[PDB]
């Protein structure tokens, strides 16, 4: 009667943006990233990678509601830095880490398959 489609969690709706940036007015150099059709899989890795950046004063994620499949990520950086730049570098760093982890896994698989 009301069971929502399962693919509605990952597929973006027509006319809906994958990510929206809203400048926070409470404190300076802060932004809120409202990403649609995501879950804790991405919020945590981006959160953790953001904390490791010393120019990031605040980095957190939340799910407004589990039934929804969106996520909100708050990023506060130093005046000399920018939050959007941190969200970008955090992704670029994660991509390189996975690329390195991927290559090092093939080698381990190859070394194990041979002997």
């Amino acid at each position: 009667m009301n069971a929502p489609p399962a693919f509605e969690s990952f597929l973006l709706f027509e006319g809906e943006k994958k990510i929206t940036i809203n400048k926070d007015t409470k404190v300076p150099n802060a932004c809120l990233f409202t990403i649609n059709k995501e879950d804790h899989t991405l919020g945590n890795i981006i959160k953790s990678q953001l904390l490791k950046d010393p120019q990031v004063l605040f980095a957190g994620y939340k799910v407004p509601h589990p039934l929804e499949h969106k996520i909100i990520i708050r990023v506060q950086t130093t005046p000399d830095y920018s939050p959007q730049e941190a969200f970008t570098n955090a992704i670029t760093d994660l991509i390189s880490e996975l690329s390195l982890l991927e290559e090092r896994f093939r080698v381990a698989i190859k070394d194990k398959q041979e002997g």
Binding site: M1, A3, D39, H40, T41, N44, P66, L67
Partner: protein
């Protein structure tokens, strides 16, 4: 030879299995109906008086014998063919068999010119048959043969089939008859009241209740009276004694007081003597009695006659209704007073109205007999008038046309179909609730419903005494299985080993006693009653004895050898009170128990050996009872019995507690019912919780019956993947829960995860649900038939058409076939049509009467059936199938009362997990454990974790000292898990460990039919009723919600007047009327022609419009009907 303690646990359960292998679960229902067909019906026919009618020629029409064939069905052609139960449930027929009685009509006119004519096998009427009974077609059939007939071998039976509805007779509780009970009412003119509901052995009239009361102190002392039947005025007991032929006060007291050396009793009866001393003869006493009644004959002659027949027929009929029995009635009436004096003098304790030893269970046997008796009389009546109006003309008559077989058939059919116990006219004096629709939601509910009891005290009653769990519910009834609504304690459930007596004749016992040294009542002298012991039989005082010790030892020896006395006979020897009451009546709830010798049991090891090879040497429970090892004990006999919970109590202890045991329990777990036996470790949980579970086990989904694909039931929930409980009791093997389970073993974790499981809620694993976790299917059957009642209008199944049919909704009828019925495998949604039916008119010459589907169903047609009903008309059944996936709102419940709805469904990735990839299928809030104290839920979660890792099935028998929490913990530490069940979990969102080691393990959970899709309801400008223009009532009618008085009071406190107005006036029934400003009565308004006038005042200008609810306008109209003039004055 002796069973050692280590082998006891195996022997007791072995003995139990033999019981359930021979008797069964619904044996009390089958034996009742069986004895009714074999003895009751034959006796009711013979006990009827021969109808002697004469204008002259005369006819008696005496019946001699009966014959009841198997259930049969006669078509229109008349070909007799056998009808199977599956055919009845499908064709909406009645699973009844014809009753054939032999009649003999002798002509007697004059001159001894007699000649007899016998009509062998006269079809007198049809009788519904109990499934699986002796006369049922499914008797003795093997599991393979029953499968050929599309029947479930596990179906216990014990129910009827009337018009396709499976009806079951609920055993009705009632106060025992022919027994003296001395009560004491606090607010009444009498201090102590001794009543005795009397009824003859072969019941033929209602219970003639006689009271023997004592007047409260404040002439000189306390006077004793007697409220006899058919008399509206109290009568001194002495007057009654004199009316029976005992004028001398000495003889009277000799019947009341058996020991003249007790002046305390003599001083207490003196006031009654001095109150009635002017009367000293039998004739005057009878005249006085007749005068006190509501029918005082002007002449003293018929006054004496009215009293004579009253004291001979209505007063104590069980003691005897013939003449010359005045002595027996006096002796009993004397004992009736003797009981009253002992109660007032404190020499005896008052009787408890709740004591089931003083109650009787009216089963189908004693129940159906009451109807057949009352109707058989109506049949002989209709036969009398019919033949009477024929012999008056001086000619013979054909009894074949006189026998109105419709009487018995339609009668038994109506009673078992509607529940009203009585004639079709007395639909209000009869007691409803009997013959309820059998619950086919799960095997546990069916067994419980077939083993259900009912006390006719009335749910309206607010007295807690009858609803309380009396001590006498032990072993006979489940102390936990009982509803929690407005019927607590009244609606009960029999125990596993409970057996209600079927009934037996006391003739053989009386013969043995007479052959014994017992002395009759008329042969003895009252002087011998002092030291002698009384002997009662079914409440009838028979005689006395001198050495009662060896008497019971003899009677007990006879019952234990299956001798003249049957096992169902109860023999209570009250010792302080010298009475010895023997009972053979039906309804006496009893249970088996292991006899005990001086200090040892009679169940030796040689028996357990033979019971193990039960399939080879045909050694069953019956051979065990005949060996004198087991004994059927009733509630009334338990008072004189000293039980032993287990053989361990029979051993020698440092301090002897009893040392004189006489009986022993097979297993204490047998005190539980059906829905309570499935609970593991019920002795570790709060009692109400075990009760709430017993009420949920009947609502749990599963496989209610194996042959669910053939049965076209209106509502049936089937579970996709049923599983047997890893933590099970050794009683499930007999309830067949292992074969037809009603739940799934779930890996539950008691933790607070996001807070979506708080306040009796749970969080489910969406991935498990995707793999068939608790998934079920909903079967709904829609029935319809085309009626050819008359040529005026005839219904017919046919694809409607927009050009010929009138009442055709906007829905499309393309899914239907030319036959008018939809085909299986088709997808059907709400508002869709499944049966295209049209009715001929007196959109011309035919109207559409199609059957649409219920809203919010979205199901698929599983199959379609077409057949012929009793009237030879077409009858179609469409079973729709809808898969119900467990979602947010669906109710789940464990076996310990832990009920809750699925708060949210988390995927396997978002759920916690142990060091290994084991996510919990369900997560509950631990806050439900402390308040409810359901420790069994924790131990079950533990024993389940040991059983899964060990490869066995946990034995969670309630009372088993060989299994505790310590042993389970040690066994769990051997498989690499925490001995207390706790386990480290990892947060599924961040992977971080959880500081608090969570408790996790397998727990058997159940899904309840109470889903959210069947309860979600909304309304916005929907239909309204006809009487009052208010929203309808119910989801099926798209009704609205009730804004009750309590809501009106709440919004009043808030001061919200507009809301209270919008809800009660604008959103429920807004209406406009026109009233005359002079008389305030509703005027005649015509908005089309713009004219308003009040006929009364004859004015048409002083009219005012009023915006009032329609219900108020209806109220004023309902008042004006009573000449009341509610005038709405707008000024």
């Amino acid at each position: 030879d002796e069973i050692t303690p280590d082998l006891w646990q195996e022997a007791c359960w072995i003995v139990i299995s033999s019981y359930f292998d021979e008797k069964g679960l619904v044996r009390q229902q089958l034996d009742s109906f069986d004895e009714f067909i074999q003895m009751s019906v034959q006796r009711i026919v013979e006990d009827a008086p021969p109808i002697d009618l004469q204008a002259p020629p005369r006819y008696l029409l005496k019946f001699e014998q009966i014959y009841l064939s198997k259930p049969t069905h006669w078509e229109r052609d008349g070909a007799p063919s056998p009808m199977m139960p599956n055919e009845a449930r499908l064709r909406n027929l009645t699973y009844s068999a014809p009753l054939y009685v032999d009649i003999t009509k002798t002509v007697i006119k004059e001159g001894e010119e007699q000649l007899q004519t016998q009509h062998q096998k006269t079809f007198i009427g049809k009788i519904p048959i109990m499934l699986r009974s002796t006369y049922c077609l499914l008797n003795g059939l093997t599991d393979r043969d029953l499968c050929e007939l599309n029947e479930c071998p596990l179906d216990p039976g014990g129910y009827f089939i009337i018009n396709g509805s499976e009806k079951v007779l609920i055993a009705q509780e009632k106060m025992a008859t022919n027994t003296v009970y001395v009560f004491a009412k606090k607010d009444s003119k009498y201090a102590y009241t001794g009543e005795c509901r009397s009824c003859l052995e072969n019941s033929s009239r209602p219970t003639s209740t006689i009271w023997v009361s004592m007047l409260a102190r404040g002439a000189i002392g306390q006077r004793i009276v007697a409220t006899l039947p058919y008399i509206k005025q109290e009568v001194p007991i002495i007057i009654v004694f004199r009316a029976l032929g005992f004028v001398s006060d000495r003889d009277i007291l000799e019947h009341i007081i058996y020991d003249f050396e007790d002046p305390e009793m003599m001083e207490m009866v003196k006031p009654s003597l001095d109150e009635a001393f002017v009367i000293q003869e039998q004739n005057v006493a009878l005249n006085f009695i007749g005068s006190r009644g509501a029918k005082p004959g002007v002449t003293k002659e018929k006054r004496i006659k009215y009293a004579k027949e009253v004291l001979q027929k209505e007063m104590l009929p069980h003691v005897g209704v013939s003449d010359f029995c005045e002595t027996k009635k006096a002796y009993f009436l004397g004992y009736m007073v003797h009981r009253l004096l002992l109660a007032a003098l404190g020499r005896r304790e008052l009787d408890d109205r709740d004591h089931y030893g003083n109650k009787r269970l009216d089963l189908a046997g004693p129940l159906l007999a009451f109807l057949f008796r009352g109707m058989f009389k109506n049949l002989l009546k209709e036969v009398r008038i019919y033949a009477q109006k024929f012999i008056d003309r001086g000619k013979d008559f054909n009894l074949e046309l006189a026998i109105k077989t419709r009487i018995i058939s339609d009668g038994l059919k109506y009673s078992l179909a509607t529940g009203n116990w009585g004639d079709q006219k007395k639909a209000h004096q009869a007691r409803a609730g009997v013959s309820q629709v059998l619950n086919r939601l799960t095997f546990a509910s069916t067994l419980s419903h077939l083993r259900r009891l009912n006390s006719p005290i009335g749910r309206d009653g607010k007295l807690a005494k009858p609803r309380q769990l009396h001590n006498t519910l032990w072993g006979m009834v489940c102390p936990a299985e009982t509803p929690e609504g407005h019927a607590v304690g009244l609606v009960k459930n029999l125990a596993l080993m409970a057996y209600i007596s079927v009934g037996s004749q006391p003739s053989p016992i009386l013969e043995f006693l007479e052959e014994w040294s017992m002395e009759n009542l008329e042969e003895i002298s009252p002087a011998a009653i002092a030291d002698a012991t009384k002997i009662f039989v079914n409440g009838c005082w028979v005689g006395i004895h001198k050495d009662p010790e060896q008497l019971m030892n003899t009677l007990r020896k006879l019952r234990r050898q299956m001798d003249i006395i049957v096992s169902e006979v109860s023999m209570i020897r009250d010792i302080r009170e010298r009475e010895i009451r023997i009972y053979t009546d039906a309804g006496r709830i009893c249970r088996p128990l292991l006899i005990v010798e001086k200090q040892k049991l009679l169940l030796k090891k040689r028996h357990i050996d033979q019971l193990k090879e039960r399939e080879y040497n045909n050694y069953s429970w019956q051979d065990l009872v005949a060996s004198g090892v087991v004994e059927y004990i009733d509630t009334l006999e338990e008072e004189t019995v000293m039980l032993a919970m287990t053989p361990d109590d029979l051993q020698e202890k440092e301090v002897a507690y009893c040392s004189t045991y006489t009986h022993c329990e097979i297993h204490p777990s047998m005190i539980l019912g059906v829905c309570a036996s499935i609970i593991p470790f019920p002795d570790h949980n709060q009692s109400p919780r075990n009760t709430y579970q017993s009420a949920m086990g009947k609502q749990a989904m599963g496989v209610y019956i194996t042959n669910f694909h053939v049965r076209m039931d209106t509502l049936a929930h089937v579970l996709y993947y049923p599983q047997k409980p890893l933590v099970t009791t050794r009683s499930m093997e007999y309830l067949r829960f292992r074969e037809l389970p009603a739940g799934i073993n779930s890996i539950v974790a008691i933790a607070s995860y996001t807070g979506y499981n708080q306040e009796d809620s749970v969080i489910m694993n969406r991935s498990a649900v995707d793999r068939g976790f608790f998934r079920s299917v909903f079967y709904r059957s829609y029935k319809e038939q085309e009626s050819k009642k008359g040529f005026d209008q005839e219904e017919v199944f046919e694809k409607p058409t927009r050009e010929t049919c009138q009442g055709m909704r906007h829905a499309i009828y393309d899914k239907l076939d030319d036959d008018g019925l939809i085909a299986p495998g088709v997808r059907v949604s709400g508002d869709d049509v499944i049966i295209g039916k049209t009715v001929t008119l007196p959109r011309y010459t035919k109207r559409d009467c199609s059957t649409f589907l219920r809203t919010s169903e979205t199901g698929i047609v599983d199959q379609v059936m077409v057949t012929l009903n009793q009237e030879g008309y077409k009858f179609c059944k469409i079973r729709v199938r809808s898969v119900r996936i467990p979602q947010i709102g669906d109710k789940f419940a464990s076996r310990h009362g832990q009920k809750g709805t699925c708060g949210i469904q988390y995927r396997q990735e978002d759920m916690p997990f142990t060091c290994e990839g084991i996510t919990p299928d369900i997560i509950i809030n631990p806050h439900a454990i402390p308040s409810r104290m359901t420790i069994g839920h924790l131990i079950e979660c533990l024993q389940g974790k040991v059983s899964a890792n060990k490869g066995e099935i946990g034995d969670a028998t309630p009372f088993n000292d060989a299994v505790n929490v310590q042993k389970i913990s040690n066994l769990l530490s051997d498989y690499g898990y925490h001995l207390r069940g706790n386990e480290v979990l990892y947060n599924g969102f961040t992977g971080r460990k959880i500081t608090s080691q969570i408790f996790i393990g397998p727990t058997y959970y159940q899904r309840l039919k109470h889903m959210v899709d069947d309860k979600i309801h909304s309304r916005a400008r929907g239909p309204i009723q006809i009487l009052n223009r208010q929203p309808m009532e119910g989801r099926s009618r798209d009704g609205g919600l009730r804004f009750g008085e309590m809501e009106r009071d709440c919004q009043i406190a808030h001061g919200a007047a507009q809301f209270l107005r919008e809800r009660l006036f604008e959103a429920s029934d807004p209406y406009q009327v026109h009233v005359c400003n002079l008389c305030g009565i509703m005027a005649i308004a015509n908005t089309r022609t713009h004219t308003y006038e009040c006929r009364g005042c004859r004015n048409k200008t002083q009219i005012s419009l009023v915006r009032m609810p329609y219900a108020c306008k209806l109220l004023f109209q309902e008042l004006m009907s009573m000449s009341i003039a509610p005038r709405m004055m707008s000024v």
